[PDB]
Amino acid sequence: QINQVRPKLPLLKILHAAGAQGEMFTVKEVMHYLGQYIMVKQLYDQQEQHMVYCGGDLLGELLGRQSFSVKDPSPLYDMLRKNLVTLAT
């Protein structure tokens, strides 16, 4: 397969809910479909769209945690490091 990620059926479903084709592409493409997933699913605080709260969502099940932010994106890179060697923060 390609030198990037791809999911299984129940995880492909999550990026399909954001109009994608699973995680079946590079870091920059997954984070694009994930940004629009959070924007549709509206899993954020009213006073701060920057802070994400995934309580009981398939995205919280996918990442293994029910919160992250656009200032602390390390939960994405912990998802990616398991597939390919890449950057983190």
Ligand X SMILES: COc1ccc(C2=N[C@@H](c3cccc(Cl)c3)[C@@H](c3ccc(Cl)cc3)N2C(=O)N2CCNC(=O)C2)c(OC(C)C)c1
d(CA 49, CA 60): 17
Q: Give the shortest CB-35-to-ligand X separation in angstroms.
A: 3
Q: Which CB, 21 or 49, lies closer to ligand X?
A: 49
No. of helices (H) and no. of strands (E), the chain: 4, 3
Q: Give the shortest CB-24-to-ligand X separation in angstroms.
A: 17
Give the CA radius of gyration of the chain. Answer: 12
Number of residues assigned to the chain? 89
Q: Give the shortest CB-43-to-ligand X separation in angstroms.
A: 8
Residues that bind ligand X (CB under 6 A): 31, 34-35, 38-39, 44, 49-50, 52, 70, 73, 76
Q: Which CB, 31 or 84, lies closer to ligand X?
A: 31
Cβ-contact 23, 15 below 8 angstroms: yes
Q: Which CB, 11 or 76, lies closer to ligand X?
A: 76
